[PDB]
Design a protein around this motif. Sequence first.
Motif, PDB file in Angstrom:
ATOM      1  N   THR A  37      -7.477  -5.967  22.347  1.00 14.56           N
ATOM      2  CA  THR A  37      -6.600  -6.594  21.520  1.00 14.56           C
ATOM      3  C   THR A  37      -6.211  -6.264  20.242  1.00 14.56           C
ATOM      4  O   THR A  37      -6.875  -6.117  19.353  1.00 14.56           O
ATOM      5  N   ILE A  38      -4.864  -5.541  20.019  1.00 14.84           N
ATOM      6  CA  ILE A  38      -4.645  -4.974  18.842  1.00 14.84           C
ATOM      7  C   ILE A  38      -4.197  -5.983  17.510  1.00 14.84           C
ATOM      8  O   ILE A  38      -3.313  -6.789  17.603  1.00 14.84           O
ATOM      9  N   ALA A  39      -5.069  -5.519  16.583  1.00 11.18           N
ATOM     10  CA  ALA A  39      -4.774  -6.239  15.011  1.00 11.18           C
ATOM     11  C   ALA A  39      -3.597  -5.442  14.186  1.00 11.18           C
ATOM     12  O   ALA A  39      -2.803  -6.069  13.867  1.00 11.18           O
ATOM     13  N   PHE A  40      -3.753  -4.394  14.071  1.00 11.75           N
ATOM     14  CA  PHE A  40      -3.011  -3.295  13.297  1.00 11.75           C
ATOM     15  C   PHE A  40      -2.711  -2.279  13.951  1.00 11.75           C
ATOM     16  O   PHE A  40      -3.503  -1.638  14.465  1.00 11.75           O
ATOM     17  N   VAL A  47      -2.034   5.077  14.741  1.00  7.03           N
ATOM     18  CA  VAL A  47      -3.311   4.724  15.106  1.00  7.03           C
ATOM     19  C   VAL A  47      -3.597   3.116  15.139  1.00  7.03           C
ATOM     20  O   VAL A  47      -2.929   2.484  14.329  1.00  7.03           O
ATOM     21  N   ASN A  48      -4.003   2.743  16.158  1.00  7.44           N
ATOM     22  CA  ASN A  48      -4.183   1.300  16.411  1.00  7.44           C
ATOM     23  C   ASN A  48      -5.559   0.787  16.140  1.00  7.44           C
ATOM     24  O   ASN A  48      -6.704   1.505  16.416  1.00  7.44           O
ATOM     25  N   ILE A  49      -5.778  -0.404  15.456  1.00  8.18           N
ATOM     26  CA  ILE A  49      -7.106  -1.045  15.434  1.00  8.18           C
ATOM     27  C   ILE A  49      -7.057  -2.485  16.017  1.00  8.18           C
ATOM     28  O   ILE A  49      -6.104  -3.238  15.735  1.00  8.18           O
ATOM     29  N   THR A  50      -8.063  -2.524  16.942  1.00 12.16           N
ATOM     30  CA  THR A  50      -8.421  -3.800  17.769  1.00 12.16           C
ATOM     31  C   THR A  50      -8.969  -4.821  16.915  1.00 12.16           C
ATOM     32  O   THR A  50      -9.807  -4.680  15.705  1.00 12.16           O
ATOM     33  N   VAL A 256       2.333  -4.410  13.375  1.00 14.99           N
ATOM     34  CA  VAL A 256       2.619  -3.069  13.106  1.00 14.99           C
ATOM     35  C   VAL A 256       3.132  -2.800  11.625  1.00 14.99           C
ATOM     36  O   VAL A 256       3.894  -3.485  11.291  1.00 14.99           O
ATOM     37  N   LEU A 257       2.482  -1.863  11.081  1.00 15.71           N
ATOM     38  CA  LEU A 257       2.776  -1.700   9.616  1.00 15.71           C
ATOM     39  C   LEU A 257       3.444  -0.254   9.154  1.00 15.71           C
ATOM     40  O   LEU A 257       3.281   0.578  10.016  1.00 15.71           O
ATOM     41  N   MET A 258       4.038  -0.605   8.172  1.00 18.49           N
ATOM     42  CA  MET A 258       4.885   0.527   7.393  1.00 18.49           C
ATOM     43  C   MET A 258       4.589   0.521   5.985  1.00 18.49           C
ATOM     44  O   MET A 258       4.423  -0.792   5.441  1.00 18.49           O
ATOM     45  N   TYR A 259       4.189   1.467   5.465  1.00 16.55           N
ATOM     46  CA  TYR A 259       3.866   1.375   3.787  1.00 16.55           C
ATOM     47  C   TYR A 259       5.147   2.001   2.934  1.00 16.55           C
ATOM     48  O   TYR A 259       5.039   1.770   1.823  1.00 16.55           O
ATOM     49  N   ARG A 260       5.977   2.737   3.729  1.00 14.74           N
ATOM     50  CA  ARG A 260       7.331   3.152   3.050  1.00 14.74           C
ATOM     51  C   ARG A 260       8.478   2.913   4.149  1.00 14.74           C
ATOM     52  O   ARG A 260       8.250   3.393   5.394  1.00 14.74           O
TER      53      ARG A 260
END
Length: 425
Positions: A37-40, A47-50, A256-260
Amino acid sequence: DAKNIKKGPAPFYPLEDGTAGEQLHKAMKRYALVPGTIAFTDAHIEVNITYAEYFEMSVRLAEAMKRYGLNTNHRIVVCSENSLQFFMPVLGALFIGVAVAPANDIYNERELLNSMNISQPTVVFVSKKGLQKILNVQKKLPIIQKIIIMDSKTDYQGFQSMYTFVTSHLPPGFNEYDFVPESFDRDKTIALIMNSLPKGVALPHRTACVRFSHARDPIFGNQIIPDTAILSVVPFHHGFGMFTTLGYLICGFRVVLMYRFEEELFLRSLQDYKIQSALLVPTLFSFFAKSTLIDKYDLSNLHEIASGLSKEVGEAVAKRFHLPGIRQGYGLTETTSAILITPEGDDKPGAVGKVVPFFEAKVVDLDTGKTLGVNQRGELCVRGPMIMSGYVNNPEATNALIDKDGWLHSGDIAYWDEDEHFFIV
Ligand SMILES: COc1ccc2nc(-c3ccccc3F)sc2c1
């Protein structure tokens, strides 16, 4: 005249008991038990973190922080660009009633010092690229005893990472699934100290718990559906980013994140991750009103675009993305999250939407203070259990904003319509 005070309806699901820590722990524990189950998802490095990884590391940090000696008399700062690691210390701290103070990671030394002089943290979590600023601030704020590095596995330049800090402090035989989060008074215990010179906005745990009711509300939030993915470019240290994300974790979504911001990465991410919902700060709306690249991507899984607007730009953006309209929200740091929100499927171009559950809203005559009726313009005022307990060590500023009756005066001019939709003017 109660007919002129707009009230939120009853929450789809009644407000849950427990601290914000406890509710995040309980939801995340469940998701952790389902492998993969993917969190971020970091869109730049891919890279995925579950949820299992996230849950275990958060719980380990909570316990390590507790054994280190942190408790409800303490605060931590979290200073970092958006990243996979950003929420680990946020969650671990909420698990133990340690207040979290996110510091804007483009603040220079001077802005940082003022922020942390209000929050007075004992421990600072920081990304590698923020270490120097924090070292320069620690010099003038000796209350900072410990600096821990977020985006490192090993120690980094003589400082512990979150991983080696945890290893230094966990008891033998520590079990992440036996761990129980701290129980405390969720009205008296501060969860977040947000920045709004800037001031510090103290938000009891209670404001987050109410946010978690809104988050999973099928009308005022996002329905909990499996394999839901969100794309978020919003700063995690700002209330828009903080309180949407915590809510997505309660929901089990993939964040799903982006920092820029970058145009291709963002549109390609919408497509390739089959994003259902996307978050934009206001200047990125102006940006996508100008974009023509949108047409080149398969965005058929995109259900919504959420805004933290002018009726023109929102209309153009919705059209480019092939959406019925924009999912707008209106809130301030001082109100935790959005207190007016577009009810799901019942949008009105140019409206910020309706009063969320538990809240109420009115508009008042400017020079007077008198409550007003439909289609009349005045200062928006709101009342509800997500309002800050106050600006930190600054009662005059607090009393200038929130009146003896609990009404927060927003400073914005608005009116509400016959359907009870609000419009900011
Ligand atoms: C579209 O749905 C949302 C959900 C949360 C939300 N939070 C907002 C907010 C929170 C804190 C400070 C400033 C904000 F705009 S706008 C908004 C809009």
